[PDB]
Amino acid sequence: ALTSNASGTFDGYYYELWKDTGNTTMTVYTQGRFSCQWSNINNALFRTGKKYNQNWQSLGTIRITYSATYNPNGNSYLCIYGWSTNPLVEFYIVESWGNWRPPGATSLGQVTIDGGTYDIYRTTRVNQPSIVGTATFDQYWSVRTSKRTSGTVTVTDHFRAWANRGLNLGTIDQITLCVEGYQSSGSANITQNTFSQSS
């Protein structure tokens, strides 16, 4: 299994274990499935998905049908997670979480997507880790009003919802199903992470 920062591809899916400090373990299976557990960490992320390198406006419709056994014991998120470049943006579509509903910022409004209600948020990170090294960038968020651990997320619908509220994206680097933890412990087993892209 993976226990230190690592990334790669398996069965057609990009995978990555990232953490600053702490005990982490991740096992990647076929079809984007993966298991992970963490403890004594500061910040850790476990994820599998697809890379794109394409402007979000031309991706058409991207839907992710996922299923997960999610058992955080503290601060944590189960989410769709990815990056954009030009501008550099780290984005989240939070489906479930631990003891704290993220992200601790002013809501920019609510929208209904895939049958669920989500609050939209913008946050900023100064000199933090990123896909291109230490950098300062914004984060865009869609956070469900209630927890869900299985279903379908029309990622491009969130992109549009964000765009309509002034949160602009550029070239999408990657889109993934991710389990994040913050100063907590927990375990999770992603049993389905299917991508569908049509125009």
Side-chain angles (χ1 to χ4, degrees):
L2 305 174
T3 58
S4 296
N5 289 341
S7 60
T9 304
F10 183 68
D11 198 54
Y13 282 71
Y14 171 68
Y15 70 75
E16 184 179 343
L17 181 169
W18 184 88
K19 60 158 184 179
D20 41 13
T21 300
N23 304 298
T24 56
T25 184
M26 180 180 182
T27 296
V28 180
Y29 302 107
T30 56
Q31 305 177 66
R33 299 177 303 175
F34 71 87
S35 173
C36 64
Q37 291 153 296
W38 67 95
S39 65
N40 316 84
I41 60 162
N42 179 62
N43 192 202
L45 284 74
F46 306 98
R47 69 196 194 262
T48 63
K50 302 286 183 173
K51 280 183 176 299
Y52 293 78
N53 179 50
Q54 188 176 313
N55 188 289
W56 77 281
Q57 181 61 60
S58 64
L59 300 168
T61 301
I62 295 180
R63 293 178 180 180
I64 293 176
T65 296
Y66 72 101
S67 302
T69 297
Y70 181 56
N71 293 295
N73 302 314
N75 195 339
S76 167
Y77 320 136
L78 169 61
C79 60
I80 295 309
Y81 168 98
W83 287 81
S84 165
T85 53
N86 194 193
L88 180 65
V89 177
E90 177 179 49
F91 58 77
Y92 293 80
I93 295 176
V94 182
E95 295 292 281
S96 185
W97 58 90
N99 61 304
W100 179 70
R101 187 185 177 228
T106 306
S107 171
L108 307 180
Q110 296 197 321
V111 295
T112 302
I113 300 176
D114 297 301
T117 302
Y118 297 77
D119 273 284
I120 296 177
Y121 310 84
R122 181 234 187 198
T123 57
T124 297
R125 303 282 298 299
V126 178
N127 292 317
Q128 293 302 301
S130 78
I131 55 173
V132 293
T134 305
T136 291
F137 51 87
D138 293 328
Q139 302 177 298
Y140 300 161
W141 310 69
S142 268
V143 184
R144 213 171 181 278
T145 55
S146 65
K147 303 174 179 180
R148 187 168 74 151
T149 56
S150 181
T152 298
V153 171
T154 305
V155 187
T156 43
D157 276 1
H158 288 272
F159 289 171
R160 177 55 61 179
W162 298 339
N164 293 333
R165 289 169 180 68
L167 305 186
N168 64 303
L169 290 170
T171 302
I172 303 302
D173 177 68
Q174 60 186 262
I175 300 177
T176 70
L177 178 55
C178 169
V179 169
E180 185 171 341
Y182 189 73
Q183 311 191 329
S184 61
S185 68
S187 62
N189 192 212
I190 277 58
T191 55
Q192 174 180 44
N193 184 23
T194 306
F195 282 61
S196 62
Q197 168 175 34
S198 59
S199 300

